[PDB]
């Protein structure tokens, strides 16, 4: 299970750091701070060990550090690493990834 | 799994985009928007890797990309892509397909 | 998995046509429509590849295309085929067959 | 499975018949229709193949055809054969069994 | 399965019936029959087959006929006998027994 | 399974008696009865067999009769044994023991 | 499993003790004891001998004595020892270790 900086996620929780929100349009048309909700965007910065629901060895999780992934809408646990803001989810509520 | 445009759904999870809405009926009698509901007919674009309920490797989904399937009348999840609207549903949501 | 008219149920659903409904008694006496509620006797037109929770090979579902059953009073799925009506069940919300 | 009069329960379902209400007393003291409440006695007329949790064979029911067996107070599946009233209940809501 | 008076109880299910209430103290005081609430103790009379949960042959239950047992507050079953009245309750339920 | 005196609890269940509440403070303040609470501490004075979860033999429980464990909150079963108070939990249900 | 000063936790349930609040900001602000919420921070003291789901030997914790772990939001269990204060939790509880 890779690391981050002094943590690391127990059994198949994922940390992941969301993108920064929108401020501009395409146009330029700025939106206010109250908006544009949260963003569903988040980049894997750390992984657990994994599961352990089958017997034997550890099933790891599909997902590792450095992949951009699409969050659910709710789920996620707030976490205070270095004053920033990180958000533990389960490796199965991730909805997917975006390969390239 | 087969992927879209930069996307790729986890475990079962597949993304389907809804058929387009009736606007008028057989006589040339149009619909307005608010009506019509919303369109329970699909294609599948994206399917994911697969389960890992049983043990051992894993198990595809039944769906394929390009198949015609109807979709249940609640459980999707939206998704934006390039901004298109689609739909992310569970394997065992679909309620059948199209044969054809 | 025997199909219908372009359709297949996916997993353990089967698709059925319900009866007609009694407009008449047997002395002649004729029942308005908003009456009789729902008819419960159907019969089987399509059957899906079957379940997969035991490991390896597909389960079939125990009814056959062709079979005249019982449905129970609620859990159905209306599907319509051709601007006709159908409704699609679970393999195990099936009461009874009846044997002819 | 050992079937009716042109039906047979699915899995684990038992179709029985509720024995006929008690109208008089011992010493002759008639009851009214509306009291009595429901029979629980019943006597069984038809079983189903058996159930499927259990790998590979069937495992039938523990009841067989012209048993008499206490029903639950509540459970049942009203069921309408030749004009007449059955009861569908599982194999498992069945309290017990009068052994003679 | 030991069975009762013309009854069987079925699966893990065991046919007990109450001790008698206390009517009087110690010293002569006499309670009244609304007061004292219901018997926890009873006496097994009747014991099922045994359960299926375990593939192969049937575990008995742990519990025989002429056992004194202390029963659970709630649970139990209503059943009348020979005008008498008994409660079936479920094997799991019985919280312990009286070993002497 | 330790029994106690002319009882024997079944399954995973244990038998325990709490300690004593605290009448005085060390200073010599003395509390009233309707304070305190109720004492989370406890002896335990009977065990059962064991439970039936694992195929075979019988797995006992972690505790031994003798043993000072520490009660949960809630969950606990009141018993009355020879005019004397015993609270009857499951083997789950101890926090943990006091190991001395 | 480690224990601690005369304690012992049951299955996989670990008692820590929580971090001390911040009572000054970084620029020497001081904070009102009713604020600052409850740590989720603490410092893992014992761990019990472990679960016992999988068939055959104990599978361990996953957490050792002397972890600085997160706690999550709500799930612990008040525990009093020598007047100190002690937080007891689940195995699964634990969003995650502080590697360093």
């Given at each position: 299970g890779q690391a981050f900086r002094k943590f690391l996620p127990l059994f198949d929780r994922v940390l992941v750091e969301r993108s920064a929100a929108e401020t501009?349009?395409?146009?330029?048309?700025m939106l206010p701070?109250?908006?544009?909700?949260?963003?569903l965007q988040a980049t894997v910065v750390a992984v657990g060990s994994?599961?352990?629901?089958?017997?034997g060895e550890i099933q790891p999780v599909s997902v590792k550090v450095g992949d951009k992934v699409l969050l659910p809408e709710y789920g996620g646990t707030k976490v205070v690493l270095d004053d920033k803001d990180y958000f533990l989810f389960r490796?199965?509520?991730?909805?997917?990834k975006y390969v390239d």
């Open positions: 501009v349009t395409k146009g330029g048309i701070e109250k908006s544009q909700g949260k963003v994994g599961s352990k629901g089958k017997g490796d199965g509520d991730i909805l997917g």
